[PDB]
C-alpha cells in the first residue's frame, strides 16, 4: 500500500507522532518518503543478513525479528512481517521505541541526509488533519 502524503500524515498524527520527542510531524512523513517512498511493503536487503521493513524500513537485525537475520535483538519485540502492513500502528510503535530522545530520528539515514535541515513542514502543509 502506497500512502498519499496527507493520509500518511493524518495516520501519524493519530498515533502520537506529532511533536514526538519534539520532532514536528513533517519529519516523519519526509522520512517515510525517502525510506520507503510511502510503501508499507517496502523491503531492503542489506550487506549482512539484515533486511529493512515496511514504511519506516525497520531493521531485522535490531528491532523486529524476521528469524532469517544473523543475530536479531528484536528490540521492538515484534515480527518483521508485522511491520509490512497497511495499518501503521506497529511501525509507529516500534519507531517510538527507536526514538528515545530528541536525536533519535538519526535512526533513519534518509531522514538525517535528506530531511534534517529542510522545510519538512512542506510535506504536510495543506493536509487536512
Amino acid at each position, epitope marked *: 500500500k502506497v500512502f498519499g502524503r496527507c493520509e500518511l500524515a493524518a495516520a501519524m498524527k493519530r498515533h502520537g507522532l506529532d*511533536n514526538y520527542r*519534539g*520532532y*514536528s510531524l513533517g*519529519n516523519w512523513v519526509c522520512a517515510a518518503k525517502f525510506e520507503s517512498n510511502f510503501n508499507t511493503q517496502a523491503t531492503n536487503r542489506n550487506t549482512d543478513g539484515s533486511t529493512d521493513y515496511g514504511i519506516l524500513q525497520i531493521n531485522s537485525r535490531w528491532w523486529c525479528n524476521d528469524g532469517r537475520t544473523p543475530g536479531s535483538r528484536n528490540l521492538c519485540n515484534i515480527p518483521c512481517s508485522a511491520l509490512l502492513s497497511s495499518d501503521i500502528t506497529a511501525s509507529v510503535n516500534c519507531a517510538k521505541k527507536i526514538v528515545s530522545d530528541g536525536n533519535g530520528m538519526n535512526a533513519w539515514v534518509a531522514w*538525517r541526509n535528506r530531511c*534534517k*535541515g*529542510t*522545510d*519538512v*513542514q512542506a510535506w504536510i*502543509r495543506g493536509c487536512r488533519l
Partner: antibody
Amino acid sequence: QVQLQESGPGLVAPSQSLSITCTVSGFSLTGYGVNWVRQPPGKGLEWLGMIWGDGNTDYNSALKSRLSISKDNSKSQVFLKMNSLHTDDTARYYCARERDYRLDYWGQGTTLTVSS
Amino acid sequence: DIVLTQSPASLSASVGETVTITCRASGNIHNYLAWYQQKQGKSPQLLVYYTTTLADGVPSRFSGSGSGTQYSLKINSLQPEDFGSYYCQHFASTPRTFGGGTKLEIK
C-alpha cells in the same frame, strides 16, 4: 557547544551596502537553518529571512528585494547582505539557529547604525 | 503574511502572581508558535515551542496553550527573574513574524 557570533560594520550610510556575518560553531549548516532577526532601538523583534540547511532561502516579503542570505558550509558562516539602506535599518541584528521550527540558539546580536 | 497580535503591551505584576500573555494570529498557524523571553540587554531565549513544549531548562511555571489562532503563555507564581519582555513568533510558513511584545514589569 552551539555558538552563533555576528560580525558587522557597525555604522553604514544609505550609499553603501551591508554584509553581516554569522559564524556558527557546535553544529553543521547542512543540518540546520539560520534565521536573521533584528530589533530596532526600543522596538520588538523583526524577522528578516533565513537560509535552510539545503541552501534555500526565504525572506521577509517587505524587505525581500534589499536582502540576500548566503552561507559557506565549510567556513561555518552565514551572511546577511542588505542594500538600499534607510535609517530605519538601524537595529540590533541577530542570527539564530532554527531547529525544527523553533529558534533555539541566538547569537549576541551586532548593533548597526544607518547614518546619512 | 500572518500577523500576530500580542497583548497586553505591558503588565505590572508582583512576584507570586500569575499572568497571561496572549498572541492572536491573523491566520491559522497550526500550533507552530514559539515564545521567547528577552531580559534587559540579552538575546531572546526560547521558552516554549509548538505551543506547549517547554524548552530544555525552562521552569515549569511557564505553560503555553492555544490551538487555531489564539495562543497564551501563562506564568504561574512569577519570580524575580521572570520580568523582562516576551514575544511570540509563528512558524506556519514563510515569512515568519513575531508578536509586538509584552513588557512584564515589577509592580
